[PDB]
Structures are given as C-alpha cells and as structure tokens.
Amino acid sequence: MTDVLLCVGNSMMGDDGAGPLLAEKCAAAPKGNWVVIDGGSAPENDIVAIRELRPTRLLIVDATDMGLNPGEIRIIDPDDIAEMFMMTTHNMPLNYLIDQLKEDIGEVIFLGIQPDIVGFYYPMTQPIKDAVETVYQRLEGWEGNGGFAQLAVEEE
C-alpha cells in the first residue's frame, strides 16, 4: 500500500545530518516510491504523520556510532538500536519511536552510518557523504534491506 522513509538527523550537527542529506537528495530526485519524511532532529513529531498513512513498511535513516570505520553502513533492529544509539553515551535509544509504529506497520527497518564528526556548526565529512550517496542510490533497488550487512557486534 504505502512505504515511508523517515530521515532523522540535524544538517549542521556534523555527520549527524545523515537523514537530512538523504531527504534532500530524495526530495530533489525520488527513489523506490518512498514517501520520504524528515524528522528534522525531532522525529517524534512525525509519528502522527506516519500514522495517517498506516504504512505497509517503514525505513529510518540516521548516523549511528557502531565502533566501525567512518562511513560504514549497517541495518539495525529495535532490539539492538536500544543499546547501539546510546553507544554515543548520550543519544536517545530511538527504538522508542519504532515502538509507536511497529504495532501497526507491517515492517519497521533502520539503517545506521558510522560518524566521525558530530557537534553543532560542523559539516558532514566525506566518508559519511559517500555513505548517504550509496544509500540514496540503493533506494531504487533496495527491495527489503539493500543487501547491507546487519549490525551484530560483528561476531557469530
């Protein structure tokens, strides 16, 4: 029926602007019929907007500290977002937002990107720009997870 893309981040808080740069690119040139939405570093406001659409699926995108190399990309899941977002020692455990939507949306998905620079009045660094570009290009053939690896403490 409907499939939404919830960008999250702040465009001048460093690499944190991951969602905002993706949202700009998708707004300029759509992909995969995603109903792009930009939470604008206050994504809880947009839960109501998402709920009006009762989406079949949702994908959410922001930077996430993963202890990886800058600009590395991973799929994440609400069971693990709860720890991995506060790996920053301060970010809200964004699974709280997913829990307001996963109860009615058919699938809720997250993609994180390893930052290197975070703080107000900083641009995004080149490797995270390249990561956001890679996600943006994937979105027209992403299918379900874009073939991106799933963050799992990189062990088995």
From Swiss-Prot:
Keywords: Aspartyl protease, Hydrolase, Metal-binding, Nickel, Protease
Binding site for Ni(2+): D16, D62, H90
EC number annotated for this UniProt entry: 3.4.23.51
Catalytic EC class: hydrolase
Effect the entry attributes to changing D16N: No protease activity
One GO BP annotation of this record: protein processing
Pfam families assigned to the protein according to its UniProt record, in alphabetical order: HycI
Quaternary structure and partners: Monomer.
Name used for this protein in its record: Hydrogenase 3 maturation protease
Species of the source: Escherichia coli (strain K12)
